[PDB]
Amino acid sequence: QTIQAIPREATGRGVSARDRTIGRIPAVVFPQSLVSRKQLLTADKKQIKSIIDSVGLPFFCSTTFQLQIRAGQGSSTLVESGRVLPLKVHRDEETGKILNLVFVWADDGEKLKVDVPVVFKGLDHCPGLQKGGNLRTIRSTLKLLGPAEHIPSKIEVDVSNLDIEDKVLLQDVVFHPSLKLLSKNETMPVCKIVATSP
């Protein structure tokens, strides 16, 4: 899923306006360093608007992405490339349009602080679930440190044994080493269930 881009030399209103209006997204790659320094690009709005829905995760930014950064003419000219993570997608309130794509570099294997959801899986069979047990899933997504290489695609929690009045905390999540949670204390419950009314 190589994304394509063409640079821009812009700041705030005035120019990003025409980019959007012809159909183009003002995006920014930069390295995890400081001043922060990488080129200032434009993805194509067609490319990005289709991509977020295709993943089906409104946090699709959990996934490392790869950029052709065309500098030249035509459909492209092979030029500088990018291995960057999406750390932020500024989706417009108005209807679902897009405003900004934030890309931080991770090509080196250097660690990052990223987003992973907690999709509920065991919901087919669970003792409280078959008593009817329903819940308030306090946490649907979380932030995990860790390298660029072994990045997970998501966390698919195992709620099969959600006891009638028990809960899956943060510790019970299936991590990997060097993906130290370490940014939240594991005392935050990520679900429960309670027998409310048959």
Binding site: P58, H90, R91, D92, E93, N134, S140, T196
Partner: protein
């Protein structure tokens, strides 16, 4: 539905805004939700009427609600006491008597949020609130 406890009262009406806080929102508490496309104002009876509509809807489709509960949050609360003079009076000589609260609704607030086990019978109650509400809303989700 009412800021019943002590408040300053007689609030300046204040003109309505062209926008919300600029970051595209996410959802606060539930799977599916609804948001206001256009700013404006909603009266407490209006919002409560939409809530009646939705609760009673899932209750009707107890068939999808008799499992447990189908939890819903409404995230707007009446704020400003809309005041008004009687129907026949010389303008002036004071201000109106407080006769109903109102709630500023911006261009991206989430009015309704909920997790009804059926996406179908949740989007089906999506369009069943803009009928009883003042503004034009939109079916969003997590």
């Amino acid at each position: 539905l009412y800021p019943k406890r002590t408040k300053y009262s007689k609030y300046r009406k204040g003109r309505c805004s062209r926008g919300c806080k600029p970051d595209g929102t996410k959802l606060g508490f539930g799977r599916y939700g609804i948001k206001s496309c256009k700013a404006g104002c909603l009266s407490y009876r209006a919002i409560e009427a939409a809530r009646r509509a939705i609760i009673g809807h899932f209750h009707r489709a107890m068939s999808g609600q008799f499992r447990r509960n189908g939890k819903i949050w409404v995230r707007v609360f009446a704020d400003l006491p809309i005041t008004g003079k009687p129907t026949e009076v010389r303008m002036g000589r004071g201000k109106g008597n407080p006769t109903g609260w109102i709630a500023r609704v911006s261009t991206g607030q989430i009015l309704f949020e909920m997790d009804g086990v059926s996406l179908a019978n949740a989007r089906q109650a999506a369009t069943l609130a803009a009928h009883k509400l003042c503004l034009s809303t939109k079916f969003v989700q997590w």
